RNA sequence: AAACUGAAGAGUUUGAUCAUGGCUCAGAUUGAACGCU
RNA sequence: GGGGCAACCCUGAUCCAGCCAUGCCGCGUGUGUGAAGAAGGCCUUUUGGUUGUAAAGCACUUUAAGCAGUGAAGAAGACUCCG
RNA sequence: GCAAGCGUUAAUCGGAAUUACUGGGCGUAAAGGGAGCGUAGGUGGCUCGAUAAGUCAGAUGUGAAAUCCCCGGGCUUAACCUGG
């Protein structure tokens, strides 16, 4: 399986969370990395994590049209 | 294709003997030209440039070895592909050709006569490790080390071969080639070295010409 | 041009358009001579250069030059047109292939026959 | 089913065959699951006309692929040789 | 503001060498001291000493060399500037002047020479070329 | 054993009140062929006299160079004014790859294998001067070892 | 063992110069067409 | 590859064949010897030069093309008899 | 000079460091925004730790075959085919 850790941008959706993932990609010609952020939607069964929390998700069978990830664990809480 | 025009005019343009004609008499007495370039104009102003010199050198080597530009370009490409000096490799290939080796052995008095004689399949080349002789009609075949050369039974008593052998003896036999006259058998044990080959020919110019 | 600037905007090569649009990226093109006339060259030169206004199968109405000495072209003659600008003729960007379809080759050409569609004399 | 078969390469009037494991439906020159051997109809005595991988062939036989008759005969000849 | 430190040290050395200064001093850091130690071991500078001053500061002083009137450091150029970092593998480290120079490489085993890193089979940040 | 080569011939005009005046300027590179090479510029009303003046200048403007068997020790990049010349050692048998102005001076030097490139201006005089400066700048591994106070083996 | 081999410029703005700057040629190439053969 | 227990049938896939110099490669259109340097063409200071060993003469050689033969290999052994 | 070919034309890259990451410039040749402020974003002082994401190294799987390259083999040579 694949595990990704990211901030949860939005928790408004019921039984759902949106996580932002930061990754570094090297530009082919120029060769300098650029920060890239892509939103990924995950399924939270108890809505444990509020917005701004850092969460780890793994790939899973599509629960819904836009969600293929699940909230296995929550590591850190926003102050 | 092979050049069909006057042999001497090529050597006159180059300004030095190309070996096209067998040296039965001195080259100077035979033709009494090549002191000046051919044609009506002869001596002329506006001396040639370095690119012209490179072109002249390439034309010299091609004319000496009776090899067209297309084959010469393939040979130069193979030389650059091969390890070591490109000019040395190209000269080695031009030596390796069958017509040249038979001419050095003396079966043919001249390189053109050797090329025709080989194309006619009188000469048989045995590759290393082969117990049966095979007739070849391509004079451009490269020779591997230790290859053996035989005259066919029909061609054993050729008059031109016999007349060519003693001219070859007067000219001298190269060390790498081993020739048995009685059996008319020639072995290519090693390829000619650059030091062995004529110093006057300049390999570098041919390499310069193909580099744009 | 810093690295960040190059990454953000980048480098751009504008592309040269063809100098022979009427050929539509083709070696030659067939047309019909809608006019056969003569014209004056530019300032340094003086002559009566033979030109034909031709409508090609590609739909353009372009002007082509008739090379060589003498020609049989006239109205409603089908000709073949290749590229090649005439330096001293403004607006003439094509050449008429001699001997291709109806443009006869030069009568007594001897040296550059293949450039003018003249058969080998026997 | 999966059939081991010869694939025709080489040059005109000079056939060279490549023994390949491929689906029966797919064409002779099409995709093949695996390559196990080369077969050369016309070859010198010193040269090895037939080369094959016994372990892979046995593996496919156990798996259930159905070898073609020509390949089976070539395998028999290789085994006896 | 000053967004580079290694480049500042390199240009300080270069300007001092062009001005024929006996020694060049600068604010000290462990990375600057390591680079100076590598230069000393390569023989481009005579010595490099860190004097601990007050207020938790330190001064790195490098004694420069001159051979036959000319500077020992023929050229010293920053490669991995802050704006564009360059990281290379073991077989991709650039050679300086056919190997007669030095490409300073900061590897996981410390800051060391390109030839030494090639011997160790290691790579890292190619920080500067000194010859 | 001195070899003289004429890089180029140029014609220049000087204007007096009465009428135009024509003069010839020549550039020649002359060298030993092993370690010593010079370039000279001569001006004369007559071409051969300009050639001779250029030779005389080149002889005094000889400098020494050091070479490994037949090739350059290391890549050399030089700028004289606008023009930029780049030189790269090549293996034996490659030959001299150069655009005339570089070729003349390299052949005077005696280098048999080299790769050259030019950037910006292609002017022959500037190219020659930049090449000459690059040859002067070049140094050998032993000289570098003495510079750094280390043995030849220690430094690669 | 080998795969690690590769870099040319020139004509043209000026009475002449250097730079800059465009335009043009020298090469390879092609499912190629047209002209002589 | 499809169907059939097999015999065998289908297969414009496939293997080949006809046309095209359309690209690449190879080969041939001959090879030696040949002077008051024939004749003619061209240039010329009108007499020399050049075409030019080029040619004629002379002695060979027959790859390719054409004729007469000869003759592999692509074939995996079917079926049938016997253990 | 090429040679069963030879040129012209059409197209692509090269030469063109003439879009310059390798590898260009901005006082006068084209080019510093009229000046400040500041959003996103880019970069960023010294010392002691945790972390190992970027970075480097090694292991595995994969990155189909052909084609490119190297060394051998077969076609009389070559193209061509072909094992590794």
The half-sphere exposure of B200 on its side-chain side, counting CA atoms within 13 A, is 7
State the DSSP code for E81. B
Query: What is d(CA C17, CA C100) in angstroms, rounded to the nearest whole number?
Result: 28
Going by C-alpha positions, the residue among B63, B62, B83, B84 that lies closest to residue B74 is B62
Query: What is d(CA B9, CA B3) in angstroms, rounded to the nearest whole number?
Result: 12
* Separation of CA C47 from chain center: 19
Q: How far is the CA of B3 from the C1' of H42 (A)?
A: 25
> Is the separation of the CB atoms in A6 and A21 below 8 Å?
yes
The half-sphere exposure of B163 on its side-chain side, counting CA atoms within 13 A, is 9
Going by C-alpha positions, the residue among F134, F117, F129, F116 that lies closest to residue F38 is F129
Query: What is d(CA F155, CA F146) in angstroms, rounded to the nearest whole number?
Result: 11
CB contact residues (below 8 A), chain A span 24-63, against chain C: 27, 30, 32, 34
Instruction: Give strand letter and number of the nucleotide nearest B32 (CA to C1').
Output: H37
Resolution of the coordinates, Å: 3.2
Q: What is the 3-state secondary structure (H, E, C) of chain A?
A: CCEEEEEEEECCCCCCEEEEEEEEEECCCCCCEEEEEEEEEEECCCCCCCCCCEEEEEECCCCCCCCCEEEEEEEECCC
Residues of chain F found within 8 Å of residue E74, distances taken between Cβ atoms: 139
Q: How long is chain F? A: 156
> Is the separation of the CB atoms in B142 and B133 below 8 Å?
no
| Nucleotide H44, nearest residue via CA and C1' | B40
Q: How far is the CA of E8 from the C1' of I33 (A)?
A: 30
Query: What is d(CA C82, CA C7) in angstroms, rounded to the nearest whole number?
Result: 43
Query: What is d(CA E55, CA A23) in angstroms, rounded to the nearest whole number?
Result: 40
Exp. method:
cryo-EM
Q: What is the 3-state secondary structure (H, E, C) of chain F?
A: CCEEEEEEEEEEEEECCCCEEEEEEEEEEEECCCCEEEEEEEEECCHHHHHHHHHHHHHHCCEECCCECCECCCCEEEEECCEEEEEEECCCCCCEECCCHHHHHHHHHCCCEEEEEEECCCCHHHHHHHHHHHHHHCCCHHHHHHHHCCCCCCCC
Query: What is d(CA F107, CA F118) in angstroms, rounded to the nearest whole number?
Result: 17
Q: Where are the beta strands (DSSP E) in chain E?
A: 23-27, 45-52, 58-64, 66-67, 70-71, 76-78, 87-88, 102-107, 110-112, 124-130
Q: Which residues pair with C37 in a beta bridge?
A: C51
Secondary structure of residue D54 in the 3-state scheme: helix
Q: Where are the beta strands (DSSP E) in B34-166?
A: 123-126, 134-135, 147-151
Secondary structure of residue B59 in the 3-state scheme: helix
> Is the separation of the CB atoms in E123 and E89 below 8 Å?
yes
CB contact residues (below 8 A), chain E span 84-113, against chain A: 84-86
State the DSSP code for D15. E
Task: Provide CB contacts within 8 A for F19, sequence distance 6+.
Answer: none
Label residues A38-71 b or e (16+ Cβ within 10 Å = b).
Answer: eebbbbbeeeebeeebebbbeeeeebeeebbbbb
Residue entry with tokens 């051969």: F48
State the DSSP code for E123. -
The half-sphere exposure of F114 on its side-chain side, counting CA atoms within 13 A, is 30
State the DSSP code for C16. P
Q: What is the largest CA-CA distance in chain D?
A: 37
Would you state the structure tokens that stand for residue C45, as one six-digit string?
């030169």
Query: What is d(CA D76, CA D63) in angstroms, rounded to the nearest whole number?
Result: 19
Query: What is d(CA F86, CA F65) in angstroms, rounded to the nearest whole number?
Result: 17
Residues of chain F found within 8 Å of residue E97, distances taken between Cβ atoms: 74-75
Going by C-alpha positions, the residue among F63, F40, F31, F81 that lies closest to residue F138 is F63
Would you state the structure tokens that stand for residue F40, as one six-digit string?
């000279």
């Amino acid at each position: 399986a694949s595990v990704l850790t990211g901030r949860v941008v939005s928790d408004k959706m019921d039984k759902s969370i949106t996580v932002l993932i930061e990754r570094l990609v090297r530009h082919p010609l120029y060769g300098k990395q650029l920060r890239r952020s892509t939103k990924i939607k995950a399924h939270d069964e108890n809505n444990v994590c509020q917005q701004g929390d850092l969460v780890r998700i793994k790939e899973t069978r599509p629960i819904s049209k836009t969600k293929a990830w699940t909230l296995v664990d929550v590591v850190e809480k926003v102050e | 294709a092979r050049y069909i025009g006057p042999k001497l005019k090529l050597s006159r343009r180059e300004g030095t003997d190309l070996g096209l004609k067998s040296g039965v008499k001195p080259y100077d007495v035979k033709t009494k030209k090549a002191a000046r370039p051919p044609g009506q104009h002869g001596v002329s102003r506006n001396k040639t440039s370095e690119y012209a010199l490179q072109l002249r050198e390439k034309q010299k080597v091609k004319r000496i070895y009776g090899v067209l530009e297309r084959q010469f370009a393939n040979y130069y490409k193979e030389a650059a592909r091969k390890r070591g000096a490109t000019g040395e490799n190209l000269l080695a290939m031009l030596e390796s050709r069958l017509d040249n080796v038979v001419y050095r052995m003396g079966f043919g008095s001249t390189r053109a006569e050797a090329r025709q004689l080989v194309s006619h399949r009188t000469v048989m080349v045995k590759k290393a490790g082969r117990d049966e002789f095979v007739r070849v009609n391509i004079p451009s075949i490269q020779l591997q080390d230790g290859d053996v050369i035989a005259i066919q039974e029909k061609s054993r008593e050729q008059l031109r071969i016999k007349n060519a052998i003693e001219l070859a003896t007067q000219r001298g036999i190269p060390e790498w080639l081993d020739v048995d006259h009685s059996k008319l058998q020639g072995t290519f044990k090693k390829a000619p070295d650059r030091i062995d080959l004529p110093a006057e020919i300049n390999e570098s110019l041919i390499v310069e010409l193909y580099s744009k | 041009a810093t690295t960040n600037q190059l990454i953000r905007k980048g480098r751009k090569t504008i592309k040269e358009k063809s100098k022979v649009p009427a050929l539509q990226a083709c070696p030659q093109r067939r047309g019909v001579c809608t006019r056969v006339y003569t014209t004056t060259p530019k300032k340094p030169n003086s002559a009566m250069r033979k030109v034909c206004r031709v409508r090609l199968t590609s739909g353009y109405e372009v002007s082509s030059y008739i090379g060589g000495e003498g020609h049989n072209l006239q109205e409603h003659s089908v000709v073949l047109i290749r590229g090649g600008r005439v330096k001293d003729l403004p607006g003439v960007r094509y050449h008429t292939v001699r001997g291709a379809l109806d443009c006869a080759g030069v009568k007594d050409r001897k040296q550059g026959r293949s450039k003018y569609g003249a058969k080998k004399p026997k | 089913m999966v059939v081991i078969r010869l694939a025709r390469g080489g040059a005109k009037k000079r056939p060279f065959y490549q023994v390949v494991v491929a689906d029966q439906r797919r064409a002779r020159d099409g995709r093949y699951i695996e390559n196990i051997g080369f077969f050369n109809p016309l070859a010198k005595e010193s040269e090895e006309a037939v080369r094959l991988n016994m372990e892979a062939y046995h593996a496919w036989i156990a798996k259930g692929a159905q070898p073609s008759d020509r390949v089976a005969s070539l395998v028999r000849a290789y085994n006896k040789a | 503001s000053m967004q580079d430190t290694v480049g500042d040290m390199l240009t300080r050395i270069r300007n001092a060498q062009m001005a024929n200064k006996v020694s060049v001093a600068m604010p000290s850091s462990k990375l600057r001291k390591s680079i100076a130690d590598l230069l000393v071991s390569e023989g481009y500078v005579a010595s490099a000493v860190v004097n601990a001053e007050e207020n938790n500061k330190a001064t790195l002083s490098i004694e420069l060399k001159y051979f036959e009137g000319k500077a020992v450091i023929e050229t010293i150029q920053r490669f991995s500037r802050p704006g564009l970092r360059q990281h290379r593998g073991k077989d991709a480290i650039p050679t300086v002047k056919q190997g007669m120079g030095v490409a300073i490489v900061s590897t996981s085993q410390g800051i060391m020479s390109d030839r030494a890193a090639r011997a160790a089979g290691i790579g890292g940040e190619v920080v500067a070329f000194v010859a | 054993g001195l070899v003289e080569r004429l890089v180029t011939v140029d014609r220049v005009a000087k204007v007096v009140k009465g009428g135009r005046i024509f003069s010839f300027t020549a550039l020649t590179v002359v060298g030993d062929g092993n370690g010593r090479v010079g370039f000279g510029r001569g001006k004369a009303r007559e071409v051969p006299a300009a050639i001779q003046k250029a030779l005389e200048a080149a002889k005094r403007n000889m400098i020494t160079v050091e070479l490994n068997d037949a090739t350059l020790h290391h890549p050399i990049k030089a700028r004289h004014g606008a023009s930029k010349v780049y030189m790269q050692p090549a293996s034996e048998g490659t030959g001299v790859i150069a655009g005339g102005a570089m070729r003349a001076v390299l052949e005077v030097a005696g280098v048999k294998d080299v790769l050259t490139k030019c950037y910006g201006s292609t002017n022959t005089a500037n190219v020659v001067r930049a090449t000459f400066n690059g040859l002067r700048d070049m140094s050998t591994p032993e000289k570098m070892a003495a510079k750094r106070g280390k043995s030849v083996d220690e430094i690669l």
